[PDB]
Amino acid sequence: SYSSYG
Ligand SMILES: [Zn+2]
């Protein structure tokens, strides 16, 4: 999984 906030 890949999650990015920013
Ligand atoms: Zn950004």
Curated annotation (Swiss-Prot):
It is found in: Nucleus. Phosphorylated in its N-terminal serine residues upon induced DNA damage. ATM and DNA-PK are able to phosphorylate FUS N-terminal region. Ubiquitous. Self-oligomerizes (via N-terminal region). Oligomerization is essential for chromatin binding. Component of nuclear riboprotein complexes. Interacts with ILF3, TDRD3 and SF1. Interacts through its C-terminus with SFRS13A. Interacts with OTUB1 and SARNP. Interacts with LRSAM1. Interacts with SAFB1 in a DNA-dependent manner; this interaction tethers FUS to chromatin. Interacts with MATR3. Interacts with SNRNP70 and POLR2A; these interactions couple RNA transcription and splicing. It is linked to A chromosomal aberration involving FUS is found in a patient with malignant myxoid liposarcoma. Translocation t(12;16)(q13;p11) with DDIT3. DNA/RNA-binding protein that plays a role in various cellular processes such as transcription regulation, RNA splicing, RNA transport, DNA repair and damage response. Binds to ssRNA containing the consensus sequence 5'-AGGUAA-3'. Binds to nascent pre-mRNAs and acts as a molecular mediator between RNA polymerase II and U1 small nuclear ribonucleoprotein thereby coupling transcription and splicing. Also binds its own pre-mRNA and autoregulates its expression; this autoregulation mechanism is mediated by non-sense-mediated decay. Belongs to the RRM TET family. This is RNA-binding protein FUS. It comes from Homo sapiens. The chain holds residues 54 to 59 of 526 of the full protein.
